[PDB]
Ligand binder design. Structure first.
Ligand code: 5MA
Lengths: 554, 400
């Protein structure tokens, strides 16, 4: 196997650091023999060279098993090697692949061993095959090539592959080359002949540079199995997903289930994972059996149904626009599809996130549009045209009245229920002929006890005692009280910016049962006007609820 | 001959991830970089450079914008202490200030061989087909604060005839731009800019018009009403109780006296003339600058922006919260992101003119919406630092 004639990549150690000096542990005779055999073969091939006694560095060697393998413990050298640039920013996604007339897979033979190592850095790769019972001096070698397990190998190989491919890519702009690890994926729209000719020209260019690749009878045939994907000539899919039928599910079983479903989510539309994920909440043992809930059984059933039949994705056509469609699956769950030609999907996906403790479908939909937008730029270098289950008017009302700079690129309403709506709207001005509730909450921070209440301009009053509470929980409880004893139209005055904030953002869902109860009330209401005052300023009705809730508390 | 650049001790070069870029923006950068390489300004690099700085393309011709925010922070001692450019107090007083892009000057001066690695950037690829195209600078890079710092001496000799001939023209160099101010009539001012463009033209280097003297306060506005409701007074006392934390001599005692008993919000309540006395007196304090607030050169500047609806935005610049050095407003086919980037740029240029430093922004937006979109509208050669905030609902109405 050749060692590429390319210019070496200069390697440095970390500033203030010298090479490893880790003592070789004595080995068994069988391990020493195995290593001697291995090392003399590599020495012949040019891979390693014998060194003198002057070299003071050392990295330990070991051998494991009918054939023997040599394992170098590069942990110490790796701790002293300079940092390298990140090999890759991401992984190619199948949906980003164009449909090519012919595609061939070329894997590089003994990749790392085919590329030289900086002459001035070779000294730090020094290792010793010990003598029987460490009696006499050992056999000393250093690497001439990129060693397996060393920190710079992935990076230096990739960089070497880049400089090599450079002149070929310049003279063949209509040829696709995917660089992945020690593989090269070559695609073109040439006729089955001039492509076969171009592959040999590539193979030959690579050989002139120490890199060996398979010939026609050894190169793989489609479908290509790569990274959990199946790449057929006119479609792609995920590899066979088989969901286990278990009597008892363990933490580990559900974890593997969730992972498999998540992976299936990229092409199979409608995959749900919330109810299964909920079972994984908390601290439970790998082998601990989790009984499924009704909701988890229902979600598993729907998922088995989705996966019953096989689904495929199509490839990318650069001359067509991408269309992204989103649907509300349920509570906090969003599902999307991306296509160019109606309903022939390139890919699919899901969004189920909790951005805060209080949110709404409008905020969730914009969060999903941003997630999809980013993804599209990564996969295709362009954003899609959205088809959203929200009316232009609902969106317009939200962005106009919300405090946050909220935006959505080119979109269109699509009537695919459940539709995204605002469940209630707060008043802009106080209501004439509605009772004004002044609300307050106060909790003692030693006892944890608090009081929640209100006073009205109609002389009405109420004070409820609460047990293991906070000032925030009491303030929210006070609002709930005022909503409960109110009637269709209310003006509410609070000194809580915290409560003001939650309610003002029009939440339709919360991780707080109290906030969900407030939502239930706000919906039933015809008109609500929420106003704010500074606390402890002796303000009108505010000083009155203050004295009432403070009594025996603060 | 290169000026040796040393990084701040203990910390090393920037290792900042590259953002996804659209097909159009990548092609624009590849074309730009191929050319800069041919011209020897940038060199293709090895994997042995662990450093990275993000790169973007802005706009009628595409231009490369390198985000040196992390490199700048890491070289602060160099461009600020060691090689600082003094900021003129006169610039903010000038009737006109023209901004000129002078960043093309930087590529005539080489970068210290031992600092070049710290300028690494990557042109990304679509669907990760290709490893990014990696490069580093051989010349002073545009967007790095160390560039005007080093070029300072060369800029001094280019401007010397112009300055000797025009002693009342203020010239300030901030990053890639030159800020040229005069108290002349607009025609004579525009004539003097053309004259300076000719001086710059003999050395290689090749307008945007501000009027700093016509920049005024955005006072905390106190309403002027016939009928005052319980709610209107409550809203007024809230606004004044908060202004009293900034401004010395604010009084609410008389307006507060009115808010007695648990009254209905819609109830019209007559005013007491002593309450009108306070109103008048507070309105007067609110129009004038804040007493006791001074710019501290060693402390960072903060800018806060609030969406007011109807395409209007309010902002405040301070160093210590609510101790406001400046307040203002930005008013607008536009969207919130486009509007927000426009306000960020206007506030930054005013901040450069007034203090010689960009503020760190508290943006009322989603990190992701901002990240994906900001480049679609960005026009400036610099990028300020920014945080993402959840605007308190009251800060919005007290600044309305
Ligand atoms: N190791 C996997 C692998 C991963 C990656 Cl990320 C890229 C790969 O190579 C392709 C190239 Cl170079 C171009 C189009 C492709 C490819 N793969 N699929 N399609 C679409 C396509 N066009 N024509 C095809 N003919 C046969 C199979 C798929 C085809 C390969 Cl084989």
């Amino acid at each position: 196997s050749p060692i590429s004639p390319i210019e070496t990549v200069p390697v440095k150690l970390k500033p203030g650091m010298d090479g490893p000096k880790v003592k070789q542990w004595p080995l068994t005779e069988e391990k020493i023999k195995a290593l001697v055999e291995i090392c003399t073969e590599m020495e012949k091939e040019g891979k390693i060279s014998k060194i003198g006694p002057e070299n003071p560095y050392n990295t330990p060697v070991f051998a494991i098993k009918t054939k023997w393998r040599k394992l170098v413990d590069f942990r110490e050298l790796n701790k002293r090697t300079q940092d390298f640039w990140e090999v890759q920013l991401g992984i190619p996604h199948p949906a980003g692949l164009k449909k090519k007339k012919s595609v061939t897979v070329l894997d590089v033979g003994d990749a790392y061993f085919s590329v030289p190592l900086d002459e001035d850095f070779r000294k730090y790769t020094a290792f010793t095959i010990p003598s029987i019972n460490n009696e006499t001096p050992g056999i000393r070698y250093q690497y001439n090539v990129l060693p397996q397990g060393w920190k710079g190998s992935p990076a230096i190989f990739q960089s070497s592959m880049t400089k090599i491919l450079e002149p070929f890519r310049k003279q063949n702009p209509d040829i696709v080359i995917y660089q992945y690890m020690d593989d090269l994926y070559v695609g073109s729209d040439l006729e089955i002949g001039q492509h076969r000719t171009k592959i040999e020209e590539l193979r030959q260019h690579l050989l002139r540079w120490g890199l060996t690749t398979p010939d026609k009878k050894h190169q793989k045939e489609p479908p290509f199995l790569w990274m959990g994907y199946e790449l057929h000539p006119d479609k792609w899919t995920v590899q066979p997903i088989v969901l286990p039928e278990k009597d008892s599910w363990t933490v580990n079983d559900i974890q593997k289930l969730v992972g498999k479903l998540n992976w299936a989510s990229q092409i199979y539309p409608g995959i749900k994972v919330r109810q299964l994920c909920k079972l994984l909440r908390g601290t439970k043992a790998l082998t601990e059996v989790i009984p499924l809930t009704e909701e988890a059984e229902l979600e598993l059933a729907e998922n088995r149904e989705i996966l019953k039949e096989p689904v495929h994705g199509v490839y990318y056509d650069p001359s067509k626009d991408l269309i992204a469609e989103i649907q509300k699956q349920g509570q906090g769950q969003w599902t999307y599809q991306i296509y160019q030609e109606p309903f022939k999907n390139l890919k699919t996906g899901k969004y189920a996130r909790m951005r805060g403790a209080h949110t709404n479908d409008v905020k969730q939909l914009t969060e999903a549009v941003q997630k999809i937008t980013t993804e599209s730029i990564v996969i295709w270098g362009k954003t899609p045209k959205f088809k959203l289950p929200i009316q232009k008017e609902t969106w317009e009302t939200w962005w106009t009245e919300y405090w946050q700079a909220t935006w959505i690129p080119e979109w269109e309403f699509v009537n695919t229920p459940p539709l995204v709506k605002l469940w209630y709207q707060l008043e802009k001005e106080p209501i004439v002929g509605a009772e004004t509730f002044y609300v307050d909450g106060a909790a003692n921070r030693e006892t944890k006890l608090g009081k929640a209440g209100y006073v009205t301009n109609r002389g009405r009053q109420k004070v409820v005692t609460l047990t293991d509470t906070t000032n925030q929980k009491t303030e929210l409880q006070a609002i709930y009280l005022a909503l409960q004893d109110s009637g269709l139209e209310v003006n509410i005055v609070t000194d809580s910016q915290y409560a003001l904030g939650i309610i003002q953002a029009q939440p339709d869902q919360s991780e707080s049962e109290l906030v969900n109860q407030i939502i239930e009330q706000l919906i039933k209401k015809e008109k609500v006007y929420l106003a704010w005052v500074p606390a402890h300023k002796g303000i009108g009705g505010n000083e009155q609820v203050d004295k009432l809730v403070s009594a025996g508390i603060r």
